[PDB]
Structures are given as structure tokens and as C-alpha cells.
């Protein structure tokens, strides 16, 4: 079955009534008829007992995301941040190191700096490229972390070669696939990534409504080489990793996704491939039409022939994707543009509305200047997350704003 | 205003339309009209930008819980577990120690063992009593953690004397007030606790519906003595602690409560004092009527005159409270009782339905035998969370089950 | 089982997972595996096919309301208004007459005037008292409609004697039991009413949140005497009436209650008896303390010894109930009182907040002056729907306002 | 702005916080600070007082549907059925006649037969074609009712010529635009229809989730000629019609849409044009590929060159649309096909899943045989509502089923 097919069918429960959709299990606990039945659900983890460990509505969304990313197993949690955090928490010990791409989401850098520091972990930031990664490896490296498309630098890493290196070094390649849109734009596991994390808040939801995140992994022998699975590997084989994300992330840290949120995210997936296709058509149109404009200092879009991302885009992404950036030259010209444009400015991505933001003063404002510049963030840069609006209507609004 | 008054009025928003209740802000992002407006909301944290940091619906529930616990500030998160974890994460550094009561919730022990170990922290478990705590203090102690009512041991710590000791040692007294029912049964901050954490899933919700948790703190000078607030103390004074729970727990770890869950929890608080009063009336009735029964080896209920908890209950709790336990003598007699009783068995508390559970095989099954016994869990023990049903109907069901 | 017991247990589904609560079936349609299976669900109405006819979440709320009102069958619909309308639509033909109490809810009078006029029906308004009803009967009378407690006149009809008369005349006694709080304060079916309708929006919900209504009926031979059940009586016996409310109200007019609303109403019932008891305790306290105040021209409360409603209250209601009125003497004094009182003014009832309103200018403003006066509405009258707040806090706010 | 643009922007509230989306006003009542403020909101209908009359969440969905259908005003209600019923209730008096197309939705025929009969109205059924309509006019005709695309006969009426005739006769042309997908496939008001009604449950929702309906009208002088607007026309001009649908449908009959449902429908509109385009691309592909198959007796699809609907489709619809039918020849061959096909059978339309149904035994089973045949329903007929799945995957499932 094709992605569009799986997206409306995968994960639908076998409802006793024939229900064509997903009931919302907004219930905290599940009862049992005897001491023994209770004892067996607690011992084996089968059946339900309490919603913080698992819930049938979240399970449907896991099964659908599993089908769409082509994974072994998915675990959903309260947000994208919670998923990045739970995945790393399940991998790492005090004294470990991570080798992380430089271009990362500002809260991933914040989480790495302020929380993984507390778990005793050090991070080395590098260009997400095999040789730079190689030369950062040490005896203590336990994970290589990159994003499918750097945001906002819009660089696409060579995933397959990074996965071969990670596999050869005995470490996990963890890919933040937030920009790959739950597999609709990219499926990093298919190229050899061991773990994907992502914010479902973005493209998967599609409506800038509620928060969710996911961790997914693939069948691999890697986890045999992590001591925490030697104290699970025998019992669970490659499922030992997602079971520990579950245990640590949900049972213990309690980062549980509401079944109301699971239900909305489950439905947003039904149109993700259609939406991402439309946004990316429009983004390529806007890229082509705006790149030669005199007031546009630089336009980055991975599907432009001469773009730096175009090589790796053509291999890993289904299209040029839904994001582009403009450099207006400086703060002053960005300001006038954003003040003039009759489109929303907000810090979200993958909404059905086209959204513009100034990373230097918002998404990346909690970082020092050097760190902004290293992430491809400059004072002229404006990021555009393209929505579902008519491409001619959008171009007219851009043109008009540029007149200001 | 009295608690019952505050519970239906506190935290109601000033709605532009006059709305008597709480709209659900199921929106991810908040837009701005200029580069500069965006930049100012990011710099100052005022106004809204993105739902993972804050949301008007969660804010209403914080303001109500603040009023009800009599706190300086509340922060809500995705679950009780997330709140215990975020509070400790905001307090602790690798190498710190915690001194924790022995009787604790099994997932709090699990979180301490499996996650706080990863943050480099060691825990010393003691009887929650001033001298045992005193003699456990070391140069590295950074927190004393107890529960308002030990579950299921039903012992009530001497909070005021523990708070005086913590204050004198320069460490935080953190109280899990899950059993104090959002201030309706106990307000630990009023006795000098620095921090309360709690599961709103339980009594506050009242319907065994959705998960939520809260962290609250009081005005105190203690945080001046924690280095992390010296790198905040000047800018924020006693609000530095809840601001860091927010930052670490929500911004970074992303343990965000859904606005659908906030809305349901906000409403459950409107009846918590009424429900807790009814449950506790009924629990005292069942305690009195069952304690002399020949098949009941031991009945614990804090409001029974000769109960070990009765001293500290009379001081700290509004009543004997909604929980009691029976010891049937052994596994075999517990089994027959639970199989025979025409009441639900499930692992939840503070639901409107009376719930029974066998801690030895469920809530405490992930602990070694010694740890079960030290928590007051034995193979004969059955815990009862008393709901809203008629007390005579309930007694008849107990009597009848005991015949088996 | 007692009412409080039934309210947390009745209508809980037999969930395949043991769920202790009610999943929300927010699904439009239910599928089938063969042409024949589809054909059989359509023929027999068994199983599910489409949410406008029936839905498992609404069914749970029907079963609980059935248990609580002590009915044969309940049907839920989108609002209290929809239920009054559907019930009458299932009873009446063009040319029929209704004999209706004078004191009625303003929208019931509006529905009777503006919509039942369109269905060809005439209404005779009378004092809700056996002899006045008797003398209004004609060959064309098809229903006697009264409210359990007139609002705001606070008169309680002699239900048992009205039901004996209706039964003797061969016509339905239809009781709006909105004030009887889903059976917690009154159960009209138990006294011989054939049909109850009510707004669940009010006391049953308890949180001034979402709209719902219900129609319920009892086992009776009456429907054999209505021709529409002779074209059903044989097949369904006393269930012919609720089946037709379903068919006309839901299948055809499509007045369907959302499963999100059913879920919230199902939970509000879990505390209705506790809330109604508390409100009514407080209302009796406020009645007693305010009735002798010099600025209070008249105070009506059914549980006051000398009140006109007290006779019939003592027989039919569980207590004096949660509503009282004050007459300030005139418009000018009502105005100052309501402007001065630090309590909410809004047009809703049975919320957890005490609510005040001026019927002459609001709830009854769409009626001519004569009709207001006949409903017990005067320019001095203020209606109080007592909430869950502390009674001393409330009395202080009243006293203080009266100073103005 | 183009339809796709309006669909993500129209109706977004001016939120005090900048919220990019729609808060859910799950609140029953709106308070006021003085007797006078209350009195003025009741007199003028401005501002809010009680959710049965209006609610900010429903208002956003009305404003968006207004923009998308290009209407004067929209009113939302609990279901498609409620909207058809409320619209006619606002138009008609006892003794009026309606002239209605023969091919109609089975519940519209049921509503006409079983409920409009109770309002004293007679219906004449005709081919939805100017001359047949003309010759059915009488002095008593008050409305001509047709559906944008007959279901399942798939005939498209000549709307513009029907609107010219209705306008010339002084009667309303009421169009059920359920198949025109909230204006994405057809906008009947743009061709001169006076009133549109539709089920938002179908294409607008897009997820087979919750029920909603809408009534919309256009600026017209027609309502001056209806006596009920002469007792409103002066005060409100063409808005007198939607104000009366509101008053009768919502204030009085209480057919109110839940704000949870409004919120889900508001979001489903954001992708309706994209979804309808994809479904209709796929439907045309399946039409073309299946029409020559030997086991397919007849295939109807409006976008096939020689189809009977193709003339009027090319004028009124944006494409061939998302529905097609197959005639398998008889009951026995339909049965084998439907039993064999690995696609869902359910009675819903415009879901993201492709749905098949056998109208003779389901959607039209409550009609006599003659009425089925007159609606284009035969024992061989299978209706397909095309979803979002891959067209090659779908064709393979059809081909395979036809082998059976
Ligand atoms: C937004 C985002 C996240 C975080 O997800 P939330 O649900 O917002 O926590 C993580 N990674 C990337 C690339 C993101 O864009
Ligand atoms: C249930 C419970 C928790 C955890 O809360 P969740 O919302 O269930 O995580 C924490 N402490 C105590 C005492 C509890 O009983
Ligand atoms: C409020 C009320 C109604 C109507 O119910 P809604 O859900 O508001 O339509 C009907 N009867 C009485 C007495 C009411 O008070
Ligand atoms: C389904 C449908 C309706 C009714 O809408 P509900 O929301 O299901 O009542 C009305 N007209 C047509 C053509 C329909 O298909």
C-alpha cells in the first residue's frame, strides 16, 4: 500500500461496533475482576491498567506513525521536545558524549545545554557530514544526532552515509524528522537511521492546534552494545530500545500525550501527504519567482537547481519541501518587510496557514550571536513555512511587502 | 474567601465576552504584527507565543490551584510523575543527595531509582520523622521528600517540624500532596513546605479521566542558597524556583499538559472539597463498622482514635481522609475477598467510584519484597479508595465479600 | 442501590479493555463486512451504522439517566429545548391542544407560541392544579405540560393528582424536570408522569459548560390510545413513545447531542446528588437569614415553613431545593442590589457558581408584561441559583449588597 | 482571495492573545455587571448571554462557511438534517407546498414525509428541471428544493435556470449543497439559489468524525413576499431569513451545534478544497478505468464525456466530483462484489477513506421499491465515495473484487 493509502487506514482499531475512526479513551484506569487478573496485567504489561503507561487512542496513533515512517515501533509523548528528551534519556549515561549537527532547533540546543548537562552528557557540535562526524568520534560517543533538514539553514545531511558510519562505530544515528513530516517528505529509518524523533505538532497535526511528539526505531542489532539492555535484549531484541523510551519517558517521567491530542494528530496524518505536496509545490513556485527579485539578497530553497541542499534533497526528500528562507540584507530591511507583509508572523511550522518568522529575534534569540550565525541565522533572514493558500495570492502578498 | 468559594471562582479568566467558564485554547501558536512585537514577547516572556511554554487554559488552572493550595505560584504539567520529576530536576545537580520517606508511591521510587540515578543523584530512604531525617543529612543533601499521607502505609508526617528542620539545614522540604487533594484535605505549604508536587489525576480530577500534575511553591529565601539561581534570584526572588520548573519541565523537556486536560481538571476542582468530604465521611463509617469484623486482621484509617496516624492527622488533615486499608491476613484470603467483592478493582485513586487494589501484586509489584514490606505493603493488604456511593450500600458489599 | 451509588455506576459500558469510564465515540459511521450485514443493521436497528441515529457514548448517558430518573427508556438530544420539542412532536398532530402550566420557562412559551403553532397545536395556559386542568380538558387535549418547580414562581404542582387525572382522561402528563435535577431532587415518573423532559445543561452538567437535554418515559398503556402508535404498539409496547422521539427528534430532525457533550454530562451526573444537596442546604440557610431583612420585600423558598410551595415540596422534592427569589420592591432597588452584589449575574441555572438574574429584563423579557406577571415575574424580583460556595461567604455578599 | 486562501484565514477570531486558531468556548453562559447591561444584551441580541442562541466558536465556523459559499450569512446547527429542517421551518406555514426533486437523500424524504406533514405542508416530487418544476407550481408553492448533485442518481440540476424560475414565481430555491462541499465543488448561491443547506458531516469535516450542518442565504428581495417577515424585513432586509432560522432552529427548537464539533468542522474546511480535488481526480481515474470492464453493467460519473450529468457538471461543478456508482446487474452480483472488496462498507460520504454502500438495502431501505427506483436506486447499484488513498491501490482492489 502507498503512503496516502496507509495514512487513512493504518492504526484504525478493530472496534467492537465497526466504528470507522478512533474513540477517545479519556479514562485513567482499567479494571480487572480478580486479584490474579490484576497481577498478570502488571507482570506482563499486556492489556491495560493505567493511562500513563499506555492507552488505546495513543496506540492507534503509534501504529499509524509506525506504518508511515516504516518503523519497528513508535512511542508517542506529550511533545516533540519530550520525544527528543525521552529517546536520549533511554540511550545515554553520565559521561557519555553526543555528536550533534550545528544547525539544530533552538530548544534542542537548550535541552542539550541545560538538561543533558544535568544527566552528565557532553555534546560536540559539528557540520552534519561524515568526515566531520568521524573526526568527532571518541571512545565515549553514544549517539550522532542530526535533523532531516536543518532549520533554518536548510541543509540536508547525507543520511545513508551517516547511518553507515554510526553502524560501523557502534553508535546510534538519531534523526529529528520533524521536517520530513512523519515520513511523507523523508523516512530516515529507511536509509539506516536507528532512531527518529519528531514534533507531531508541526506538519503531522497540520492545524497549529495541539502538541505531540514521537520516538520510533528500526530493527537493528545495535542495542546489544548498550549495557542498559544487558541488565531486555534477550526478551525483546530490537524492541528493547522503544520499551525503555516507554518506561523512562512515560511510566517514570510521565510525559504522556493526552488522548484528545492523539485523536487530533491521528486525523491530521490523514492529509499530511496531500498538504506537504501542496505546500512544497507552492514553496517551489515562490522560490522560483522571488529568487531574482532585487530586494532579496539570498533565497534558499532545497529544490532550486543551484541550491546547496539540492544534491541531498534529490536523494532523501520527496520534493523541495515546504520551507524556504529570504535574506533581506539586514535587521532594518527584515523589519520593514515583516511589518509590511499581510501574512501571519508566528513561531510554528507546518500549519495550514503560511507563517513567517525572524529567527535572529525569536526562535534563536536565546542563543548567543556566534551560535545564531553557526546555525545559518543572520539579522536579515526571514523563514517562511508555506501553507495551503493560493500560490498567486501568496506571491502577490510577498511582492507587495517587498515594495515596502 | 473559604476553600469552597475559591474553588469555583479562582482562576476564571476575564473573558472579553463575559464567559462564565474557561475557553479551551487548543492552539499551538500566537501571532504578532511586527518583527519588534515578536522580539519583545520572546525577550520578556510576556504575552503568548507557543503553547509548549504557556497557554491561557493551563494558566487558569495554575491560578486556581495557587488559590486552593495557598501558594506563591503553580506550574502544571502532563502528569503527577512529570511534576515530581520537573520539581527535582529544577532543584538538583549531579552529586546531590535526596532524603526521601520510605513509604512512597512506587513510580516515585522507580523515578528515583531509574531516572534520578541518571542525573547523578543518590537517595537515602528514612522514616519521615525529624530525627531520622536529621541523622540522614549530609553536606550534599539538597531536598527532603515526603508524601502528605504515605500510600498505602497511611502515616502522616509531622510537616511543621520537618519544614523547620529543612529551613534550618538550608534544604527544600518537597511534599507530594497528592493525598491532600489540592489543599482540600491538606495544605503543606501552610505548614512551611517549600515545594508541593501532586497528581491532579486523582482527587482534583475526581472522574478517573485524564492525567495532569502540578508543582507549587511558597515565598521563601531558601532559593538564594541554590547556585542555579545565582547564574534569577535578583530578578524574580522566590519566583525563581517555579520559573525554572517551567523552563526545564515545559520549555525544554516539553512535559506540557493538554488544554483539554487543563479544562477537565479545572472543573474537577469545583467539587473537590465536597467530594473529599463525602468520601472521608464514608471512609470513617466503613473504618468504624469493619474494624471489629473477625475476618479483618488489621484496619488502618487515620481518623480512628487509636490509629497510628491519628495524632498527625488531627493536626494536618481536614478529616480522617478518603483512604483506608484492610489486612485479610494473607494472599489467599485477599484473593478470595477481591474476587468476591462486587466493587471495582483498579489502580487509581480519588475517582467517584470506590476502587480496591492489592498493592503487593500491583502498585508495588515492581519493587523487591523488602521494599514492599518497608512501605507497609504485605500479602494480606487491600487498599480502598472510597468514592461517592451510599455508605450502607458500600458496607453491605464489604460484609458480603468478607462472607467469602 | 441508592441514587448516589447508581450515579457513578449506571451506564458504564462493558469496555473490552476494562476501562473505568466512557470512551468518546467521535466517529460518524460504523462499517460492516457484507452487503447482508449492512442490510440487517438497517432493518433491525441493532448495532451501529451512523451517529445521528445512535452512538455508544450517548447510550451510556441514556442508561445512566434512565437509572437515575427510574425510567423505562431515555433519549438524549442537543439541548433541553430540543427534548421538550421532540417529546411534543412525538405526541401531537395538527388540531391537538395542550394544557400547559402558566409559570413556564420563557423559551418553552416561545417554542409553544412560535413553533407548535406551526405544527397546528393550540395551548391553553392554566394554574398547574387538578381542577383548573380538568376544566381545561377538551376532546382535543393530548397532553398536560407542567414543570416540577415553576421557574421563577417556585410553585410545586401536585404531580400525583395531576398524573391520576391525565391517566383518567387518556392524555399524557409531560413534566419538565429540569429543577428536579435528573431525579436527585424529584422523580416525576415515580409519581405517575408519563414523560419527563429536562435540560441537562443545568444541574446534571453542574459546570455551565455544554448543552444537552433528555426525554424519558415510563411503562404505561397510554400510548395504545395514540393513533401514531397504531399505524409500533404491538412490536414495542410502552417503548413505542421513546422510539418515536428517537426517530423524529434524531433520525429526522437531527437534533443530536455531540459525544463530547454526552461525556461531560455523564460525568456531571456523578456529583449531582452531592451538589444539589449542598446548594439546597445553602439556599435554606440564605432563605432563613435573609427573609426578615428590611430591604427584602418578599423571599420565596420552598423549604420555608410558611412558603406557598412548602406543602407540595415536602411530598415531591428531596429538600427545599437550590433556588430562591428576593423581591426588592421595584426595578430601581433590584438594579442597585444587582449592580452592588459581588456575585455573578448570568442566565443559567445549576452551575457550581451562585448566579443571580432579573427575570423581568432577561429570562422573561421576550414576553409581554401580563405574561411576565402571570409567571410570577415582577420588576422587583431577583432569582438566585445557589452554587457550591461557603454559605457564610455568600450571606456576607448578600448583606453587603442590600446595604446599597 | 481564492477559496484555498479563504479556507485557512476566514473566520479566524481577533484573539486578545494573538492565537492562531480557534479557542473552544465550552461555556453555557456569559455574565454581565449590571441589571442594565443584562437587559441591553437581551434587547439587542448583541454580545453573548447563553450558548443555545450563539457562541464565539460556532460564529467563527459561520464566518468561514459564509466566505467559502460566498453567502450573506451562515447559521450552524447540530446536523445536516437539523439545517434542512430549520431552513424549511423558517420558510413554511401550514397549507404551503414544496416542490422537491425526486432523487433526494432518504432522510430528507423521511423528514418531508413524517415531519413536514406535521407542520401541514405537502410535497410534490418532480424531475429537478425547469419545465417539470413550472408545471408543478401552484398558488401555494413556497419553495423549490433540490440537491446540487442527486444522490445516488448523480444528476446535476440546471441551477441558474431553476433560480431564474423561482425568482420569477416569488418562491425560494433551496439547494442542498452537501455534494458541493461547502463551495469547494459548487456554490449554488452564486447561480441565484436563495438558500443553501448542507451536512458539514460529510466533505467539510473530512474525517467521518462529528455531525454539523449549515444554513446560508444570499442578499435578495424575496423575503419581502413572505408574511412572517412582515409581522423584520425593515429592520434586517435580506438578513431577516437567517435571523429567523436562528431564532426558530436554535433559540426555540435548540438544535445547537457543540463548540467541540464547530472546532473540528472549522479545521476540516482548511483542507476541503485539496481533499475534494484529490478525491475527484481519483474518482475520474476509477470511472475511466472501470467503465469498460465486462462485470460493470453501467458506471455513472459526472465527468465522463458521455455521462448524462456531464452537461450540467461542466457548468456548475469545479470537477467531475468525488462520487461514482457501479451497477453490478443485480442483488446477487452486488453482494459478491461488496463481500469481496477489501474496502470499507459504511453509510457516510466525504470521509478520507473510500467507502462503498448498497443504497437499495441501506441508505434507501426505508423507502418503498417505487421510490427507490425513482431515485435511481436499483438492486445492482453500488455507490462509491472516493477517499484520499492511492488511485492505483484503489483500482487494484476494485479489479480484484470484480474477479469475485
Ligand atoms: C517544533 C520542533 C520540535 C519540538 O516539538 P514540540 O511539540 O513543539 O515540542 C523539535 N524539533 C524540531 C525541528 C521542531 O521544529
Ligand atoms: C498517582 C500518583 C502520582 C503520579 O501522577 P500521574 O498523573 O498518575 O503521574 C504521584 N504521586 C502519588 C502519591 C500518586 O498517587
Ligand atoms: C434552561 C431550561 C430549558 C432548556 O434547556 P437548554 O439545554 O438550555 O435548551 C428547558 N426547561 C427549563 C426549566 C430550563 O430551565
Ligand atoms: C448526510 C446528508 C444529510 C444530513 O446531514 P447529517 O449531519 O448527517 O444530518 C443531508 N443531505 C445530504 C445530501 C446528505 O448526504
Using the atom order of ligand 2, give the atom closest to the CA of residue B84: 10
- The answer to whether residues B97 and B142 touch, using CB atoms and an 8 Å cutoff, is yes
Alpha-carbon distance of C192 to A316, in angstroms, equals 74
Q: Do A19 and C263 touch (CB under 8 A)?
A: no
Residue in the block written with cell 520549555: B251
Q: Whose CA is nearest to atom 1 of ligand 1?
A: A199
CATH 3.90.1150.10 fits B271-404, yes or no: yes
Burial state string for C159-172 with b = 16 or more CB within 10 A and e = fewer than 16: bbbbbebbbeeebb
Q: Write down the experimental method used for this entry.
A: X-ray
Alpha-carbon distance of A76 to A267, in angstroms, equals 15
- The answer to whether residues D99 and D93 touch, using CB atoms and an 8 Å cutoff, is no
Q: Kindly list the residues from chain C whose CB atom is less than 8 angstroms away from the CB atom of residue B271.
A: 206, 271, 274-275, 352, 388
Beta-strand pair C344-345/D141-147: unpaired
What angle, rounded to 10 degrees, do the helices at C331-340 and D35-44 form?
110
Nearest-by-Cβ selection for D20 from B16, B23, B31: B31
Would you state the cell numbers that stand for residue A299, as one nine-digit string? 533565497
- The answer to whether residues D20 and B28 touch, using CB atoms and an 8 Å cutoff, is yes
First to last CA, chain C: 49
Q: Where are the beta strands (DSSP E) in D186-340?
A: 195-199, 213-217, 298-300, 323-327
A177 lines ligand 1 (CB under 6 A): no
Residue in the block written with cell 476542582: B269
- For the CA atoms of B122, B125, B129, B133, the dihedral, rounded to the nearest 10 degrees, stands at -30
Q: Do B82 and A253 touch (CB under 8 A)?
A: yes
Alpha-carbon distance of D327 to B158, in angstroms, equals 80
Q: Is the peptide bond before B402 cis (omega within 30 degrees of 0)?
A: no
Q: How far is CA B24 from CA A75, C347, D25, D53, in A?
A: 26, 22, 7, 20
Helix, strand or coil, per DSSP, at residue B19: strand
- A393 CA → ligand 3 middle, Å: 47
Which residues lie below 8 Å from residue D298, measured CB to CB, with a gap of 6+? Answer: D325, D326, D327
Alpha-carbon distance of D385 to D325, in angstroms, equals 9
Beta-strand pair A213-217/A73-77: antiparallel
Q: C2: nearest CA in chain B?
A: B390
Q: Please state the φ and ψ torsions of residue B176, each to the nearest 5 degrees.
A: -70, 105
C-alpha distance from D37 to closest chain B C-alpha (Å)? 11
- The answer to whether residues B213 and B108 touch, using CB atoms and an 8 Å cutoff, is no
B81 lines ligand 2 (CB under 6 A): yes
Which residues lie below 8 Å from residue B149, measured CB to CB, with a gap of 6+? Answer: B155, B156, B179, B180, B186, B302, B309, B317, B321, B323
- The answer to whether residues C63 and D367 touch, using CB atoms and an 8 Å cutoff, is no
Neighbours of chain A (3+ CB pairs under 8 A): B, C, D
Q: Kindly list the residues from chain C whose CB atom is less than 8 angstroms away from the CB atom of residue D351.
A: 28-29
C-alpha distance from A212 to closest chain B C-alpha (Å)? 9
Chain A residues contacting D, CB < 8 Å?
A: 1-5, 7-9, 18, 20-21, 206-209, 267, 270-271, 274-275, 278, 344, 346, 348, 351-353, 355, 387-390, 392-393
Q: How far is CA A121 from CA A108, A124, A167, A229, C175, in A?
A: 14, 10, 21, 19, 70
Using the atom order of ligand 4, give the atom closest to the CA of residue D213: 7
Alpha-carbon distance of C313 to C283, in angstroms, equals 14
Please name the residue ranges forming H helices in C106-236: 106-111, 130-136, 159-169, 233-236
Residue in the block written with cell 571512545: A139
A76 lines ligand 1 (CB under 6 A): no
C-alpha distance from A6 to closest chain C C-alpha (Å)? 18
Which residues lie below 8 Å from residue A313, measured CB to CB, with a gap of 6+? Answer: A156, A302, A303, A307, A320, A321
Q: How far is CA C16 from CA A38, C34, C124, in A?
A: 15, 24, 52
Alpha-carbon distance of A316 to A160, in angstroms, equals 9
Q: Please state the φ and ψ torsions of residue A260, each to the nearest 5 degrees.
A: -65, -45
- The answer to whether residues A57 and B357 touch, using CB atoms and an 8 Å cutoff, is no
Alpha-carbon distance of D307 to A171, in angstroms, equals 62
C-alpha distance from A316 to closest chain D C-alpha (Å)? 21
First to last CA, chain D: 49
DSSP D308-321: TTHHHHHHH-SSS-
Would you state the cell numbers that stand for residue D24, as one nine-digit string? 473552544
Q: From the CA of C112, which ligand is nearest? A: 3
C133: Cα separation from own chain's centroid: 21
In which element (H, E) is residue A279 found?
Answer: helix A272-290
Alpha-carbon distance of C278 to D201, in angstroms, equals 41
DSSP A75-116: EEESSHHHHHHHHHHHH--TT-EEEEETT--HHHHHHIIIII
Domain ranges of chain C: 1-270, 271-404
- The C-alpha angle with vertex D86 and arms to D80 and D91, in degrees rounded to 5, equals 130
Q: Whose CA is nearest to atom 5 of ligand 2?
A: B80
Would you state the cell numbers that stand for residue A335, as one nine-digit string? 523589519
- For the CA atoms of C196, C202, C205, C207, the dihedral, rounded to the nearest 10 degrees, stands at 180
Q: Kindly list the residues from chain C whose CB atom is less than 8 angstroms away from the CB atom of residue A22.
A: 26-27
Would you state the cell numbers that stand for residue C211, as one nine-digit string? 448543552
Would you state the cell numbers that stand for residue C352, as one nine-digit string? 457550581
C103 lines ligand 3 (CB under 6 A): no
Exposure on the CB side of residue A118, measured as CA atoms within 13 A: 27
Q: Kindly list the residues from chain D whose CB atom is less than 8 angstroms away from the CB atom of residue A280.
A: none
Nearest to C336 by CA among C384, C404, C392: C404
Nearest to D327 by CA among D360, D280, D369: D360
Q: Kindly list the residues from chain B whose CB atom is less than 8 angstroms away from the CB atom of residue D28.
A: 20-21
Which fold is adopted by the domain D1-270?
A: 3.40.640
Residues with CB under 6 A from ligand 4: C 52, 254; D 79-81, 84, 105, 108, 147, 151, 176, 178, 199, 201-202, 211, 213, 349
Helix, strand or coil, per DSSP, at residue C113: helix
A52 lines ligand 2 (CB under 6 A): yes
C-alpha distance from B102 to closest chain A C-alpha (Å)? 18
- C207 CA → ligand 3 middle, Å: 15
Neighbours of chain B (3+ CB pairs under 8 A): A, C, D
Amino acid at each position: 500500500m502507498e503512503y496516502t493509502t496507509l495514512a487513512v487506514l493504518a492504526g484504525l482499531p478493530e472496534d467492537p461496533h465497526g466504528a470507522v475512526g478512533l474513540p477517545i479513551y479519556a479514562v485513567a484506569a482499567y479494571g480487572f475482576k480478580t486479584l490474579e487478573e490484576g497481577q498478570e496485567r502488571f507482570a506482563t504489561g499486556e492489556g491495560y491498567v493505567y493511562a500513563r503507561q499506555k492507552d488505546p487512542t495513543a496506540k492507534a496513533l503509534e501504529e499509524r506513525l509506525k506504518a508511515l515512517e516504516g518503523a519497528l515501533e513508535a512511542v508517542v509523548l506529550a511533545s516533540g521536545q519530550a520525544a527528543t528528551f525521552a529517546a536520549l534519556l533511554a540511550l545515554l549515561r553520565p559521561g557519555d558524549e553526543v555528536v550533534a549537527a550545528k544547525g539544530l532547533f533552538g530548544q534542542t540546543i537548550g535541552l542539550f545545554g541545560q538538561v543533558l548537562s544535568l544527566m552528565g552528557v557532553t555534546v560536540r557540535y559539528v557540520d552534519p557530514e561524515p568526515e566531520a562526524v568521524r573526526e568527532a568520534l571518541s571512545a565515549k560517543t553514544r549517539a550522532v544526532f542530526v535533523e532531516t533538514v536543518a532549520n533554518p539553514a536548510l541543509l540536508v545531511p547525507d543520511l545513508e552515509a551517516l547511518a553507515t558510519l554510526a553502524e560501523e562505530a557502534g553508535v546510534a544515528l538519531v534523526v529529528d524528522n520533524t521536517f520530513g513530516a512523519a515520513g511523507a517528505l523523508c523516512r530516515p529509518l529507511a536509509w539506516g537511521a536507528h532512531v527518529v524523533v519528531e514534533s507531531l505538532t508541526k506538519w503531522a497535526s497540520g492545524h497549529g492546534s495541539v502538541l505531540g511528539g514521537a520516538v520510533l526505531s528500526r530493527e537493528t542489532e545495535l542495542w546489544r552494545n548498550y549495557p542498559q539492555f544487558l541488565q531486555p535484549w534477550e526478551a525483546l531484541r530490537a524492541r528493547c530500545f522503544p520499551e525503555r523510551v516507554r518506561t523512562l519517558g512515560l511510566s517514570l517521567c510521565g510525559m504522556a500525550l493526552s488522548p484528545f491530542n492523539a485523536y487530533l494528530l491521528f486525523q491530521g496524518l490523514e492529509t499530511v501527504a496531500l498538504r506537504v505536496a501542496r505546500m512544497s509545490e507552492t514553496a517551489r513556485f515562490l522560490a522560483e519567482r522571488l529568487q531574482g527579485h532585487p530586494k532579496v539578497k539570498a533565497l534558499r530553497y532545497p529544490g532550486l537547481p543551484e541550491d546547496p541542499a539540492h544534491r541531498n534533497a534529490r536523494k532523501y526528500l520527496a520534493s523541495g519541501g515546504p520551507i524556504l528562507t529570504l535574506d533581506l540584507g539586514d535587521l532594518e530591511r527584515a523589519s520593514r518587510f515583516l511589518g509590511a507583509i499581510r501574512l501571519l508572523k508566528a513561531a510554528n511550522l507546518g500549519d495550514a496557514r503560511t507563517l513567517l518568522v525572524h529567527p535572529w529575534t525569536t526562535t534563536h534569540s536565546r542563543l548567543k550571536e556566534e551560535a545564531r550565525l553557526q546555525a545559518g541565522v543572520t539579522p536579515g533572514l526571514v523563514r517562511v513555512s508555506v501553507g495551503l493558500e493560493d500560490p498567486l495570492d501568496l506571491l502577490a502578498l510577498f511582492e507587495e511587502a517587498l515594495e515596502a
